[PDB]
Amino acid sequence: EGLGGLERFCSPGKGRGLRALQPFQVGDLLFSCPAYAYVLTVNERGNHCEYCFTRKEGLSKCGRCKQAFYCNVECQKEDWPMHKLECSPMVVFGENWNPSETVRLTARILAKQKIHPERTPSEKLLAVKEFESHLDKLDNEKKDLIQSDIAALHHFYSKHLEFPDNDSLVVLFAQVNCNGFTIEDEELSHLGSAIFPDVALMNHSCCPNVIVTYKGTLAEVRAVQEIKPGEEVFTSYIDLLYPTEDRNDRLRDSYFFTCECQECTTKDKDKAKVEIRKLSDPPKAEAIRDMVRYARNVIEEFRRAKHYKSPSELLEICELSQEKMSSVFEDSNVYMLHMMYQAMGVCLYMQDWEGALQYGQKIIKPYSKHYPLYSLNVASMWLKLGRLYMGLEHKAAGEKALKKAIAIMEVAHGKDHPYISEIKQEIESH
Numbered sequence: 001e002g003l004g005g006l007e008r009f010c011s012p013g014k015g016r017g018l019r020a021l022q023p024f025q026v027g028d029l030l031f032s033c034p035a036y037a038y039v040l041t042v043n044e045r046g047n048h049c050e051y052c053f054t055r056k057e058g059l060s061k062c063g064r065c066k067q068a069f070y071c072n073v074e075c076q077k078e079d080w081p082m083h084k085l086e087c088s089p090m091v092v093f094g095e096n097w098n099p100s101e102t103v104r105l106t107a108r109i110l111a112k113q114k115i116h117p118e119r120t121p122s123e124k125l126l127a128v129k130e131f132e133s134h135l136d137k138l139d140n141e142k143k144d145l146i147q148s149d150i151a152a153l154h155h156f157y158s159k160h161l162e163f164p165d166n167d168s169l170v171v172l173f174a175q176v177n178c179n180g181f182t183i184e185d186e187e188l189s190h191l192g193s194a195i196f197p198d199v200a201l202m203n204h205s206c207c208p209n210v211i212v213t214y215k216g217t218l219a220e221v222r223a224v225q226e227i228k229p230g231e232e233v234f235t236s237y238i239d240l241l242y243p244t245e246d247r248n249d250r251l252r253d254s255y256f257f258t259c260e261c262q263e264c265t266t267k268d269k270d271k272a273k274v275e276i277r278k279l280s281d282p283p284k285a286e287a288i289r290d291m292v293r294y295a296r297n298v299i300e301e302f303r304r305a306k307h308y309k310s311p312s313e314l315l316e317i318c319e320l321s322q323e324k325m326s327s328v329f330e331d332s333n334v335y336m337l338h339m340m341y342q343a344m345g346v347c348l349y350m351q352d353w354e355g356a357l358q359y360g361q362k363i364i365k366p367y368s369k370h371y372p373l374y375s376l377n378v379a380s381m382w383l384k385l386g387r388l389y390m391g392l393e394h395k396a397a398g399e400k401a402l403k404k405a406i407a408i409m410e411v412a413h414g415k416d417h418p419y420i421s422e423i424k425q426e427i428e429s430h
């Protein structure tokens with residue numbers, strides 16, 4: 001089956017890719033991909049529906065496990081062939097049931113291949129079986145991690161799946177690591193993980209021409225730039241706030257390729273991204289190389305500390321790190337912004353609304369200067385600052401920030417996306 005107005009071609013040096021045949025304007029929808037296989041992240045059960053992802057109050061709990069909710073019984077029955085892979089296992093394993101989301105999603109992919117071997121509507125251009133794996137590029141540490149996931153798959157999903165051999169399972173796992181998507185809500189909060197075959201056919205660019213948004217469990221690809229007939233459709237696979245070197249470190253590590261787009265070539269946004277303090281005695285080169293090294297290393301240590309250190313301690317880390325950095329860097333620097341965004345999140349947990357709003361206010365502007373025009377990160381930030389304002393009863397400011405969020409969202413999600421009608425109703429109440 002073909003996908004209208006688009007075409008799968010051979011992108012030189014980028015393997016298989018998707019190009020446009022007709023023109024697409026900013027905001028236009030390229031295509032929609034129903035999810036081939038998906039799973040709702042554990043920290044969201046009860047909040048969202050396990051079948052359609054609809055966010056609602058009062059959802060039908062599952063009688064057997066009491067850990068899976070639905071809007072009604074049609075969603076419960078419709079989700080059974082997939083939920084049964086964990087209902088009983090969740091009750092029998094109890095506190096020992098902790099498969100990694102990657103393992104859960106892969107189990108669902110195996111169940112899907114068994115129930116529907118034929119090509120699905122989610123595979124009109126690219127098929128799950130023909131996914132790029134990058135297995136020959138794997139080293140021993142990465143092969144060891146894929147081995148731990150195969151051990152988890154067998155350990156938790158043996159009641160129903162018919163596993164092939166380790167050769168086939170390390171391939172599928174490499175394929176999921178290369179083409180698996182993560183679903184986020186209107187605030188970029190993680191909801192789940194899914195497999196979107198046709199969507200996984202678009203290569204990466206740091207200057208993307210399309211954004212992927214989700215309408216429930218449906219992928220929607222909308223043009224954020226003008227796409228002319230014959231030019232490739234490009235998506236951003238990573239967080240575009242960081243400098244070139246950081247971006248490619250993530251691209252090479254996770255996707256086995258070194259981007260070459262205009263941005264990675266000329267590195268225009270790099271300067272402002274690593275703004276140095278216009279001091280009287282401007283910092284020395286080696287001082288900057290040393291500060292970038294320290295910053296990158298503390299990013300990693302904070303990722304590690306978020307797993308056992310109390311919020312007070314984490315906040316102390318963002319403050320002390322921002323202290324030591326503020327001597328070479330400007331607050332617009334992406335490393336100061338990183339520590340600040342993390343601090344704002346910690347305040348959001350502690351329910352220190354005013355502290356979270358203060359940090360947000362400080363972050364938003366540089367955030368706009370660093371990301372593209374239509375960026376889901378910028379929109380979700382405006383959305384968060386807007387709901388912070390409205391919660392605290394700052395109607396004027398909340399209305400301004402919310403309007404900014406709807407500005408970008410109308411392009412990315414389309415003007416009729418339920419998220420937008422929801423924010424508009426959010427403006428008509430406080």
Ligand SMILES: Nc1ncnc2c1ncn2[C@@H]1O[C@H](CSCC[C@H](N)C(=O)O)[C@@H](O)[C@H]1O
Binds near residue numbers: 179257
């Ligand atoms: N800009 C780019 N430069 C080189 N390779 C790219 C690229 N963008 C995507 N890729 C390749 O695309 C894979 C992502 S899945 C995207 C489609 C892929 N080209 C395929 O034929 O199946 C990456 O692992 C990498 O191999």
Ligand code: NI
Binds near residue numbers: 041101
């Ligand atoms: Ni996770």
Ligand code: NI
Binds near residue numbers: 178179180
């Ligand atoms: Ni991706």
Ligand SMILES: [Zn+2]
Binds near residue numbers: 053
């Ligand atoms: Zn539902």
Ligand SMILES: [Zn+2]
Binds near residue numbers: 062063064067068087
């Ligand atoms: Zn259940």
Ligand SMILES: [Zn+2]
Binds near residue numbers: 206
């Ligand atoms: Zn790039």
